[PDB]
Ligand binder design. Structure first.
Ligand SMILES: *[C@](O)(C(=O)NC1CC1)[C@H](CCCC)NC(=O)[C@@H]1[C@@H]2[C@H](CN1C(=O)[C@@H](NC(=O)NC1(CS(=O)(=O)C(C)(C)C)CCCCC1)C(C)(C)C)C2(C)C
Ligand SMILES: *[C@](O)(C(=O)NC1CC1)[C@H](CCCC)NC(=O)[C@@H]1[C@@H]2[C@H](CN1C(=O)[C@@H](NC(=O)NC1(CS(=O)(=O)C(C)(C)C)CCCCC1)C(C)(C)C)C2(C)C
Ligand code: NA
Lengths: 306, 306
């Protein structure tokens, strides 16, 4: 037993990280088959960032201006193109370590693993949620740009995130691997509206189910509620509305524990209204919302990967 | 910026995990050079566990009773020996993926990465501390036994933990890779004393330094204290005594922030006495104690690995 914020094993993704340099900027690229993907702002000077014209900056660059290094070994760049906010560098060698992969655009409230990298070398691995306002709460220093987020579906790596930039709140924005920003963000260093950071209600419930499965049961009560009554209380606390689809998604957890979703919602309502009275759930004093129902099922049933 | 509980990249360790079966028990082994290490209780029936005589159980077993599988491929066992609470299975093939490695016995308060595995297949990766009472707060289901804990020192993997058993509190006990239990534990299914779980004071301070570096500063105050006065307050809250060695170890963090350790101790004293008044530090409502000063420096300076 026990329940931890757990990342996917990073081996298949470690074999894909390279270093990409353009001028004085060094960051990370993703090497899959004969393409290296990296943030297009690798081409920018610190002045360019304020108001970049990426088409105009990119025109000044040739293949030989993109230095791509795989560990100690230099890769030959035979092509470059911009797709949305990523550069695709065509190299003359297919990555021999390319795993089975796809590019997926994740939904808000879904989780993924980040392999934080610096100079093309993996630093560490952690779990993130795509927040309802399309930010993530990561750990990214200077040099971490081009670090990727992924899920593993048995042997297949689904890449969903590339790291580009930091908001003033210290949260993180980036693109899918087609170079489309999550959320309203643009790769320019100017004031930009981030949404209210709402709590992923369905994830909080999943985690309460995890707690009960792991024998933390103090917050169970004699009460029930309705979707409509729960949602009236939740909206006041900036919780996402709970839907019948969410009830259905929690089915395995309600089935395993014998605790109806609406009864668990009654527990959550009391915890929101009363707080935790200095008590903890799975060693947390806050309601955790970065575990999906799938994450909980997965970790409470224990299925593995390639 | 941002600060997360981050594991080491798991690739070098994923290449070492195998499945080990003896009778009806399947668990995980660690394959390094031509040796597979696994918990000796792989040999036990469910009845044996109550009061096992491992020498007597092991005598009934031959090399051909230990089924060792590396992905789909069977390994030939040419020898077996017991060292303390681990079995060493000699196989006829050196693991071609053996990284540079050592076996280290970690100190209480030190952290490491766990690669949770089932049937020899890596499931996920998370960070643990060796608690002052020589337990860890992991995520381990049936099948997870033989899962290992490690640190990476550039290219060298230091293995420090093998998972064996769960305490009634839901925390975890296991051995170093020489098969010596951390703490007072023995591999028998009988009532066993676990120590009080004290907080790793030096780690809490490291994390407060991380918070200040990441701009969470609300808990800084106008006050200072002394080691002796801090320790009087801490002992009441089951915090480890703070020593001058701990002050010296925080040196890089005090140097980077310009905040004397004793001034940070003054902040911690107020947080212990007053609580957090519903506020959070690095998105936590509790004082985090599973980050070492090295972990904080590492993640706030960003150095990488092989
Ligand atoms: C990344 O490219 C990298 O690792 N570079 C290598 C060379 C070291 C780098 C990572 C920064 C620290 C994690 N990313 C960037 O430099 C991007 C690009 C330039 C500026 N930033 C960036 O992250 C900005 N943040 C930023 O501009 N954010 C906003 C504007 S803002 O923060 O509200 C403010 C107006 C500056 C106050 C714009 C984007 C949407 C969110 C807000 C900082 C360097 C200031 C952290 C690009 C092109 C955005
Ligand atoms: C592990 O071997 C494994 O993954 N096995 C494969 C086949 C599935 C397995 C993991 C268990 C769940 C994580 N480990 C064990 O089975 C060990 C071995 C037998 C029993 N346990 C074990 O973890 C016990 N816990 C246990 O006995 N703990 C105590 C005693 S106790 O919990 O206080 C009590 C008396 C039972 C109430 C003894 C060890 C020190 C801590 C306390 C449980 C199966 C009950 C979880 C071994 C030999 C210890
Ligand atoms: Na917390």
């Amino acid at each position: 037993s026990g329940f931890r914020k757990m990342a996917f094993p990073s081996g298949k993704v470690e074999g894909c990280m390279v270093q990409v340099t353009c001028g004085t900027t060094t960051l990370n690229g993703l090497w899959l088959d004969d393409v290296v993907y990296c943030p297009r702002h690798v081409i920018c000077t610190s002045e360019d960032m304020l108001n970049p014209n990426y088409e105009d900056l990119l025109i000044r660059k040739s293949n030989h201006n993109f230095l791509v290094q795989a560990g100690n070994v230099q890769l030959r760049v035979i092509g470059h193109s911009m797709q949305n906010c990523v550069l695709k560098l065509k190299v003359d060698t297919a990555n021999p370590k390319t795993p089975k992969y796809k590019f997926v655009r994740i939904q808000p409230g879904q989780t993924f693993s980040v392999l934080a990298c610096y100079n093309g070398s993996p630093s560490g691995v952690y779990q993130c949620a795509m927040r309802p306002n399309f930010t993530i709460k990561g750990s990214f220093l200077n040099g971490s740009c081009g670090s990727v987020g992924f899920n593993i579906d048995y042997d297949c790596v689904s890449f969903c995130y590339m790291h580009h930039m930091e908001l003033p709140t210290g949260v993180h924005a980036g693109t899918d691997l087609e170079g489309n920003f999550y959320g309203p963000f643009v790769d320019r260093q100017t004031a930009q509206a981030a949404g209210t950071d709402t709590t992923i209600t369905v994830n909080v419930l999943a985690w309460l189910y995890a707690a009960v499965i792991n024998g933390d049961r103090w917050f169970l009560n004699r009460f029930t509620t309705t979707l409509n009554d729960f949602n009236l209380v939740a909206m006041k606390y900036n919780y996402e509305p709970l839907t019948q689809d969410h009830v259905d998604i929690l089915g395995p957890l309600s089935a395993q524990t014998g605790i109806a979703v609406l009864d668990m919602c009654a527990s959550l309502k009391e915890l929101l209204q009363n707080g935790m009275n200095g008590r903890t759930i799975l060693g947390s004093a806050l309601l955790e919302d970065e575990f999906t129902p799938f994450d909980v099922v997965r970790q409470c049933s224990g299925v593995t990967f390639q």
